[PDB]
Amino acid sequence: KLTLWTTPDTSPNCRIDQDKDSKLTLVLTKCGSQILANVSLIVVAGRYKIINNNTNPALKGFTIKLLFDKNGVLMESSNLGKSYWNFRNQNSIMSTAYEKAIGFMPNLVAYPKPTTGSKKYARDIVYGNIYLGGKPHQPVTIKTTFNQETGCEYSITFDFSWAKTYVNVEFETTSFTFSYIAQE
Amino acid sequence: KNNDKLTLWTTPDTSPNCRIDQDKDSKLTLVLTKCGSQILANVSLIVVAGRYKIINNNTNPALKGFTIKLLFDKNGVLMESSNLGKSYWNFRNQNSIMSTAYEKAIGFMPNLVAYPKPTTGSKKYARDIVYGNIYLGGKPHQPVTIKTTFNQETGCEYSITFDFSWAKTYVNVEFETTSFTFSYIAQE
Amino acid sequence: KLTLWTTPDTSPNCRIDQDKDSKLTLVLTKCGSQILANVSLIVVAGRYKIINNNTNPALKGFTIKLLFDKNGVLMESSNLGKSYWNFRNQNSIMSTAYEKAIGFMPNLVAYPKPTTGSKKYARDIVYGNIYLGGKPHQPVTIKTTFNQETGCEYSITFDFSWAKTYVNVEFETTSFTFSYIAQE
């Protein structure tokens, strides 16, 4: 169907450091040649759950990677658990594994895989801000990069970073919308 | 027939449809376009009259925001108690609306699993918020924050709240804004 | 078709200062009443390829204009080349010029053409930020304005501007998504 998502409940589905330490809520809606993407993050456990830059002054970011094979199937090496990622069915997911989602993959001409000696253009990046706890003075950068991972046919990489000293701040975010050019 | 039941909108005209401070003091231009599981939302605000038409933070140093609330019942019907007026909030027909008031728009409502109503002692997650910026008079040095919150209002089944705020001293600045696009997860 | 675009390749298609000095990657996807727009810019040659505000302290922006006739056909006077602008076919364009794209045009009631004595509202503008070289400390403002150009029925204008002193910074950008209300 036209929506590939994580069920948007708060049940953990993602490993940043350890199994099920986070809930990535990602919704990809196919509008023909463009994927409309909506993303938020809740860290439920482990070193990123509560940021304390007094205790850890160098703790300033982390990465969640979605790696896809040539059929647009999520690879086990992804931070997002494979069992949680599927076409929408009501407020859940299809009960059976999808076989193909190439129509949701980032376009390889728009966003080529990195090669040695190739001119690397920034158009495979989208920057956004999201806010911890919905507080306007707790921005974090969410940088989304398309097809820059090795060992896959396609990738969506979320780099989360911050440039303020956050003390005892739960890492759970507002939402950000972006789009990207679809492979087909 | 030209009924577009994949668009719930305030027509794109500049006819006032909203009360911030007084009846019909503003045009909230809000277009909700259903792209299946996601609503693509486009918003701007024109304050046409009343206290918030012209911001003067010399005269009113504490005036740094205001709120527009859309409250919906269980059928996604806008409640009369909302800031937004009901009469031209409807499914699209060309540059106007469907000839009768809609009875159901649950497909345009913010998803209650994604954006649960608050209950006493409930863990509040921020993912029911989207932040954006719009600019007064289209001037790059006149930013205002538009914070959109889903389903956080009491006495309704769904809600979309727009909190406008600014963090600069605006002196004799007309409150009429650039547009901002966001999306949210649809209830169905 | 539901996508009007520049192919997603890096082949120059746009004149900022001189013919083919830039690749504007612009994808307009019709989602009913709204056009979902995705934009990035690569300057490949001429005065805007490498910004040096030490040498050129007044170089703080430039404009790319798409002018359309009453049928939503791109006019030759546009910065974007006409041969590069068409309905999608896979990763390329239809080989034959489109005759009608009014469904992709910015709504004239939402975004009226300027007239003397008529109140000009800012809602025909969307602001965004993109980043030169994908570097978070190299923001540029991309201001998009609907239907404000003379000598056309519809227009999309991209005003690029910056306030920072950029020294030897290549003008090639991250991507930005916005939407606008469609004429029909």
3-class SS letters over chain C: CCEEECCCCCCCCECCCCCCCEEEEEEEEEECCEEEEEEEEEECCCCCCEEECCCCCCCCEEEEEEEECCCCCECCCCCECHHHCEEEECCEECCCCCCCCHHHCECCCCCCCCCCCCCCCHHHEEEEEEEECCCCCCEEEEEEEECCCCCCCEEEEEEEECCCCCEEEECEECCEEEEEEECC
Q: What is the resolution of this structure in A?
A: 1.6
Q: Which of B4, B33, B176 sits opposite C121 (nearest CB)?
A: B176
The reply to whether A25 touches chain B by the CB within 8 Å rule is: yes
What's the distance, CA B42 to chain centroid?
Answer: 9
Experimental determination approach used: X-ray
% helix / strand / coil in chain A, to the nearest 5? 5, 45, 50
Q: What is the domain count for chain B?
A: 1
Contacts of B111 in chain A (CB under 8 A): 8, 91
C-alpha–C-alpha distance, residues B91 and B141, integer Å: 36
Q: Helix, strand, or coil here: B144? A: strand
C-alpha–C-alpha distance, residues B95 and C56, integer Å: 47
Amino acid at C167: V
Instruction: Report the gap between the CA of A148 and the closest CA in chain B (Å).
Output: 26
Are B11 and B85 in contact by the 8 Å Cβ rule? The answer is no
Measure Cα distances from C171 to A87, A108, C7, C51 in Å.
38, 22, 20, 7
- Shortest CA distance to C112 belongs to which of C145, C77, C157? C145
Amino acid at A153: E
- Shortest CA distance to B181 belongs to which of A53, C49, C146? C146
Q: How many Cβ atoms from other residues are within 10 Å of residue A126's Cβ?
A: 25
Structure tokens at A74: 């999520």
Compute the C-alpha angle A146/C159/C76, nearest 5°.
95
Q: Cβ contact (<8 Å) for A125 and C172?
A: no
Q: Helix, strand, or coil here: B101? A: coil
Contacts of A36 in chain C (CB under 8 A): 31, 36
Q: Cβ contact (<8 Å) for C176 and A126?
A: yes
Supply the range of the domain harboring residue A145.
3-181
- DSSP symbols for A130-159: EEBTT-TT-EEEEEEEES--SSSSEEEEEE
Q: Cβ contact (<8 Å) for C133 and A141?
A: no
CATH number at residue A57: 2.60.90.10
C-alpha–C-alpha distance, residues A11 and A17, integer Å: 17
